[PDB]
Amino acid sequence: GMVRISIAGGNEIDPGSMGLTLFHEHLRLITEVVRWNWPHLYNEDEELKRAIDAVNAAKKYGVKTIIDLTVAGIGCDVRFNEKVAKATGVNIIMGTGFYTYTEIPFYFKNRGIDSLVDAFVHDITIGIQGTNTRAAFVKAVIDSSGLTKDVEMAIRAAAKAHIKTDVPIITHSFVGNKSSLDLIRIFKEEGVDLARTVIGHVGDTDDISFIEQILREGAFIGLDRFGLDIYLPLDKRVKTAIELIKRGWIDQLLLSHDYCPTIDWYPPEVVRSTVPDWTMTLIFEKVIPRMRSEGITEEQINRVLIDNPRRLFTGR
Amino acid sequence: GMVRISIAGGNEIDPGSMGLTLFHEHLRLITEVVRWNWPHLYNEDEELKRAIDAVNAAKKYGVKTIIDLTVAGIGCDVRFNEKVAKATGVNIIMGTGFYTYTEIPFYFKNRGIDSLVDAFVHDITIGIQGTNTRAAFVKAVIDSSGLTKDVEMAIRAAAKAHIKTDVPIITHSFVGNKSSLDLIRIFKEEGVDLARTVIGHVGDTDDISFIEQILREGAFIGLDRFGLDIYLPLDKRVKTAIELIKRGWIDQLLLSHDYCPTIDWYPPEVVRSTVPDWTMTLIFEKVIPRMRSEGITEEQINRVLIDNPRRLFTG
Ligand SMILES: CCCCCCCCCCCCCC(=O)O
Ligand SMILES: CCCCCCCCCCCCCC(=O)O
Ligand SMILES: [Co+2]
Ligand SMILES: [Co+2]
Ligand SMILES: [Co+2]
Numbered sequence: 176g177m178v179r180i181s182i183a184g185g186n187e188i189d190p191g192s193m194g195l196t197l198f199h200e201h202l203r204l205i206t207e208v209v210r211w212n213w214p215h216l217y218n219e220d221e222e223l224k225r226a227i228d229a230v231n232a233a234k235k236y237g238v239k240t241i242i243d244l245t246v247a248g249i250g251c252d253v254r255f256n257e258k259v260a261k262a263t264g265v266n267i268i269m270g271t272g273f274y275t276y277t278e279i280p281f282y283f284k285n286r287g288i289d290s291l292v293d294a295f296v297h298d299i300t301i302g303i304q305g306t307n308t309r310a311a312f313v314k315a316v317i318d319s320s321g322l323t324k325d326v327e328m329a330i331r332a333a334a335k336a337h338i339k340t341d342v343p344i345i346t347h348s349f350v351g352n353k354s355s356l357d358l359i360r361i362f363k364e365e366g367v368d369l370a371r372t373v374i375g376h377v378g379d380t381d382d383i384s385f386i387e388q389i390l391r392e393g394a395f396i397g398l399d400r401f402g403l404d405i406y407l408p409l410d411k412r413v414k415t416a417i418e419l420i421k422r423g424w425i426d427q428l429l430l431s432h433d434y435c436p437t438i439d440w441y442p443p444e445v446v447r448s449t450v451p452d453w454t455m456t457l458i459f460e461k462v463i464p465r466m467r468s469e470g471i472t473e474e475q476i477n478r479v480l481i482d483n484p485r486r487l488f489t490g491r
Numbered sequence: 492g493m494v495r496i497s498i499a500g501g502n503e504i505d506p507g508s509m510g511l512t513l514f515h516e517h518l519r520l521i522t523e524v525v526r527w528n529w530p531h532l533y534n535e536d537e538e539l540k541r542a543i544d545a546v547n548a549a550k551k552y553g554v555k556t557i558i559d560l561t562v563a564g565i566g567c568d569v570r571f572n573e574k575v576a577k578a579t580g581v582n583i584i585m586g587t588g589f590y591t592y593t594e595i596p597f598y599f600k601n602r603g604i605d606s607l608v609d610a611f612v613h614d615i616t617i618g619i620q621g622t623n624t625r626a627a628f629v630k631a632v633i634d635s636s637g638l639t640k641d642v643e644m645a646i647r648a649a650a651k652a653h654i655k656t657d658v659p660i661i662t663h664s665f666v667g668n669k670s671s672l673d674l675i676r677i678f679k680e681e682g683v684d685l686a687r688t689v690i691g692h693v694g695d696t697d698d699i700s701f702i703e704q705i706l707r708e709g710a711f712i713g714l715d716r717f718g719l720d721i722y723l724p725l726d727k728r729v730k731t732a733i734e735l736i737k738r739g740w741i742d743q744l745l746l747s748h749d750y751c752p753t754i755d756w757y758p759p760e761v762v763r764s765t766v767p768d769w770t771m772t773l774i775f776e777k778v779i780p781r782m783r784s785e786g787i788t789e790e791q792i793n794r795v796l797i798d799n800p801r802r803l804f805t806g
């Protein structure tokens with residue numbers, strides 16, 4: 176009767192039971208080819224401990240549900256997420272897609288777009304990685320390389336999988352080249368209702384004119400990297416969030432941290448040194464209190480953190 | 492007192508016991524990110540049967556040793572190769588390297604070349620994938636995209652790992668853009684003895700003067716894709732191999748098929764339709780009999796299929 180959302184560990188929830196949700200986080204971000212070939216560079220016990228400690232920190236602030244935006248290309252592992260879910264009791268929602276900024280595998284290029292659609296559709300309708308945990312969203316990615324041929328093919332495939340299954344599309348974009356607008360254009364060509372999409376990493380700018388260009392199209396926007404000052408400082412992100420509420424856009428806003436308890440792209444020392452304030456709790460510690468002090472209401476914070484993630488999954 | 496070569500399944504051999512060797516083959520060629528995320532697209536039992544069947548086929552012609560050129564990027568799996576080795580009794584030599592034509596992972600780019608060197612050195616000195624099977628060679632790869640910055644880094648890392656460990660370098664190149672010559676240039680910059688290297692896929696051309704430009708540098712050349720007519724037809728490959736022995740180059744020639752019993756880049760029906768003669772035995776069925784017919788001797792075939800693979804590993 177309702178949408179059914181698989182969560183890690185074998186169960187399903189309805190959108191109404193998501194509760195307070197962090198819509199864009201990670202449990203472990205790692206690179207399949209490196210981990211497959213060089214296991215010596217990794218420590219699964221420490222990775223799991225870090226994920227568990229971060230999710231438990233969020234749970235203390237009343238987070239009920241975390242959407243793990245880790246998909247193929249950045250190391251999605253259902254079985255690892257099952258262990259975090261068992262340990263913390265937080266609902267972990269997973270998805271499908273192919274994360275790349277430039278190229279896709281020969282496997283798919285040599286078979287054509289439908290082979291990639293079909294793999295996503297498999298995950299959504301049957302289950303991820305031989306499990307009964309189905310993908311509840313599809314991801315599309317674009318970054319500072321722009322719309323390469325292969326990047327365009329993967330965005331189109333995500334769009335086509337959404338058309339077949341009706342799961343929402345959660346995206347990653349790069350604000351510096353206006354690549355967010357390419358997602359919009361392709362999604363419209365493919366017939367996607369933009370209200371079932373999130374334009375990711377829009378919080379990495381404070382350019383209101385650019386942000387409202389996206390918002391006027393009807394998509395959700397991801398104010399989704401709070402704590403990554405290297406993309407945009409915290410004070411600018413909070414000022415932007417507050418201004419967009421004051422201009423009437425609350426129903427389109429989604430907040431998160433994009434936190435990676437492990438990320439293999441960089442040594443852990445370098446992450447600590449560069450973005451020491453990045454955690455999975457900074458929204459609760461710093462952002463919400465500042466918004467409340469500037470007149471944002473309790474019920475407006477609930478609309479953003481509860482209603483908006485729920486409606487991404489249900490529609491109107 | 493001799494070089495020690497690990498082989499799949501825990502043991503070590505010396506170069507003198509390699510015997511008749513196929514120096515560039517594959518047992519399973521698969522894409523890590525795809526197999527990790529989409530296991531439904533694969534069938535390990537079928538992959539294993541195909542690898543066993545091909546290796547057994549070669550074993551019937553007296554092959555004793557196969558060098559698996561599958562490294563990171565094309566799905567190297569020591570445990571898989573252990574199964575094949577146990578079933579067939581053929582010695583399987585493995586290596587290390589990073590197979591790419593364009594990019595390498597952020598993991599390494601963000602840490603610097605020495606991180607990639609160190610990973611290769613780990614495989615050579617400790618072992619691959621948590622096993623006591625050590626990499627006995629290092630691979631460097633360039634193709635139709637030419638010398639990208641990341642390709643350059645991986646070629647240089649291969650060279651630096653060779654300088655530290657003395658294992659041979661076995662390469663992949665692409666003949667249409669003369670990328671083979673970028674390998675040589677970089678290896679010379681890094682101080683590599685080219686006699687300890689193989690310039691791969693040189694058999695994809697019949698341009699004898701180009702092939703000789705590479706030969707005069709002192710490296711081994713890989714006449715290594717017999718049966719891949721899409722790269723060069725069989726008759727042209729065999730004519731080239733005969734001519735190069737007649738000209739005096741035998742000590743630098745290596746023959747193989749590059750055969751992939753499974754390859755996930757293309758559906759199997761497409762492979763069968765396009766290269767229906769590609770197998771791990773075509774050299775024995777078609778190539779050697781034509782060479783013998785044209786005056787190449789029994790001993791010359793042994794020098795190429797036994798002595799040259801051995802000398803790659805001993806100097
Ligand atoms: C030199 C900068 C080092 C620290 C940078 C932290 C990295 C932020 C990674 C952004 C999120 C990972 C990828 C993704 O989730 O799309
Ligand atoms: C248009 C269809 C072409 C199908 C032909 C099969 C091609 C296989 C060649 C790849 C060789 C493996 C990669 C490598 O070993 O470097
Ligand atoms: Co992202
Ligand atoms: Co993310
Ligand atoms: Co090759």
Ligand SMILES: [Co+2]
Pocket residue numbers: 515516517560749
């Ligand atoms: Co090969």
